[PDB]
Amino acid sequence: APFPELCSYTWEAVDTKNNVLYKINICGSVDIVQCGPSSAVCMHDLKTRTYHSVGDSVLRSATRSLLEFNTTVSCDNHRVQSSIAFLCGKTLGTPEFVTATECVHYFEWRTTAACKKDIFKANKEVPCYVFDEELRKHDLNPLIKLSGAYLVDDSDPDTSLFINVCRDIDTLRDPGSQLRACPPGTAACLVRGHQAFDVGQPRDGLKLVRKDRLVLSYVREEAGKLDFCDGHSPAVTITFVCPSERREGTIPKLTAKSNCRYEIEWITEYACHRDYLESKTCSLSDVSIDLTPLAQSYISDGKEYLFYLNVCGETEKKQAAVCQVKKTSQVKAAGRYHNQTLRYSDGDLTLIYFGGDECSSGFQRMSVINFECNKTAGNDGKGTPVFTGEVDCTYFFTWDTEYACVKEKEDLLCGATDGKKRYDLSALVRHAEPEQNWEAVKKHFFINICHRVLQEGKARGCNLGKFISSPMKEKGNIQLSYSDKTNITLVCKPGDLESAPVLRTSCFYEFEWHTAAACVLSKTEGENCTVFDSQAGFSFDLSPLTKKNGAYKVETKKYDFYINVCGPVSVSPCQPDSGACQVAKSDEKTWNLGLSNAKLSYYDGMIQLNYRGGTPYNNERHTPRATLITFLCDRDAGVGFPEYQEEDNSTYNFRWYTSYACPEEA
Ligand SMILES: *[C@@H]1O[C@H](CO)[C@@H](O[C@@H]2O[C@H](CO)[C@@H](O[C@@H]3O[C@H](CO)[C@@H](O)[C@H](O[C@H]4O[C@H](CO)[C@@H](O)[C@H](O)[C@@H]4O)[C@@H]3O)[C@H](O)[C@H]2NC(C)=O)[C@H](O)[C@H]1NC(C)=O
């Protein structure tokens, strides 16, 4: 019951309505001063910064699915208590708030840790959620792959980085996969043809670094063999960002990869806040869910009792959704419609019946149903409740049914891949522009790509214009299925972004478009601070960012870095030829992080600068320092500021979000 895979972390659940945050530690105690020592569940209040412990680590007991943390302080009932109802899950999960009184506090937790067979357990998994400062919940548990991995986008054809989110990669029951050669325990697998190396393992949980960005770090450390990483400990730092109209969705992209210190930006909807829904219904609402189909008697074998459940209706003393009968025939109501509560809470469907007859103790009976998704449940889809424990006369049940399976995506990307080949239509996108729409040859056929129509001649602000689903690689081309329908075929025409879609076919519609946007993406280089993508139509030019008497200053804990774009830096201690320079804030000792130059690299929306001159290190290898600046497209960032990436002591990577990297330039 004190499952190991959950110990050594302090978890968090939130009473979204009463404005309360609970900290849970199922093995030790919360590290906090303010709710004393050996508090296993520490309640605290956002109104009234008042931190009251509501479960002690020593006073711990289990009964069936429930783990119980009792206290000695009194409430009256009599003493304050916290329970967690455990269900087997597909990932490590997070405890969710169910309900509380002034005595009891109830949580539920779907986790692999409560599964009895160890096949469902990852070699190593870490918490995969954060709370922001509005207590809104960012949870990446849906991105976690139980089998396989995600290929990270990179320009190099000979090597591929594969990652999983918050756990290692499961290579099993897929022997044909190229991942098979990857050593076990790896969250981040580098393959070079036929070798497979471990460049990162799960360590700590998801962090929130600067109000909005989720950061996860894989490390290796205890391995040794810096084969081709020349002295550096391999590492992977993923940065998860919530899509905008400043920055729309992407696949995971490799923004840096020197010295086996890999950096990954990944813009995906699963990074945005999770909404906590509620109602006094059997229906909720991102997307809908309806539990009225199950009102169809349901019964569950209890301790020495039977439970009778009629959820959502009476099926025809009464007014009692759940009734308890001792197997002797005296009966008690365990919950009624006088307040029933249906919660969808970060993927968890939970139903409480708050009525109930008062028991011999001071408690008024209560019933909690945790619905689980099962398409092939039984009772042709409706399934059947299972009694899973009782505490202070609250009775818990778990209920597989197909009518709990409502798990909708819509992280629609405007690209497509085919092995390592990637395609991206972002150049066609016209977004609330001074630009017009596209017009092929309403009123006139007006088209936009992975975006609503613009009101330039005005069509229909959302005749029928669809505008959902991601594009796919059809018969040698890219197909875009606009669904209510319009099928758009886009054909690679190197160099041409100027031309428009065409006629072809009049409730079905078909357009054909020859565009450089339909060409496979590839890496290009340029000089004089410009880079020309010839298969696409255009060039990027970062020269406006070039300072004349340089210095973009970048302050960290111990260092100030001074860098310029495509020209040298010019401040007090630095050598006048470096494009990047490190000054220690206590000592003013200075390192040269590489000579400036104006050769731009460009691949799939990332522009790169590499300074390579650089003060040597203290070793036989002659190894001079180097600097990487990755420029990333942020439409409304403007010129933007550089940002140092924390790595080891000998890697100098900067990220720079700027409009000048976005597909509006020369
Ligand atoms: C970045 O800018 C610098 C200037 O500060 C530049 O050095 C210059 O390089 C070019 C080409 O290497 C030199 O020659 C030409 O200047 C004339 C102006 O009359 C242009 O017509 C030229 O265009 C052609 O240049 C080459 C000449 O054969 C061709 O190979 C090329 O394909 C073009 O068709 C070019 O601009 C120029 O004289 C120097 N400047 C000095 C002072 O020596 C540097 O080369 C630029 N980087 C580039 C262009 O990639």
Residue numbers in the entry: 8 to 83, 88 to 296, 301 to 311, 316 to 335, 341 to 351, 354 to 467, 476 to 496, 512 to 533, ...
From the paper:
CI-MPR has four non-adjacent CRDs (domains 3, 5, 9, and 15), each with distinctive phosphomonoester and phosphodiester glycan preferences.
Crystallization screening of human CI-MPR domains 1–5 protein in the presence of 10-mM M6P resulted in two conditions yielding diffraction quality crystals. Interestingly, both conditions show evidence of the N-glycan at N591 of a crystallographic neighbor partially occupying the carbohydrate-binding site of domain 5. Although we were surprised that the domain-3 binding pocket did not contain M6P at pH 7.0 conditions, the presence of the N-linked glycan near the binding site of domain 5 could perturb conformational equilibria between substructures that stabilize a domain arrangement most favorable for crystallographic packing. Comparing their bovine domains 4–14 structure at pH 7.4 in the presence of IGF2 with our human domains 1–5 structure at pH 5.5 or 7.0 shows domain 4 rotated ~180°. This latter possibility of allosteric interactions between the CRDs is consistent with our crystal structures that illustrate that domain interactions can be dramatically altered in the presence or absence of ligands, such as between domain 3 and domains 1 and 2.
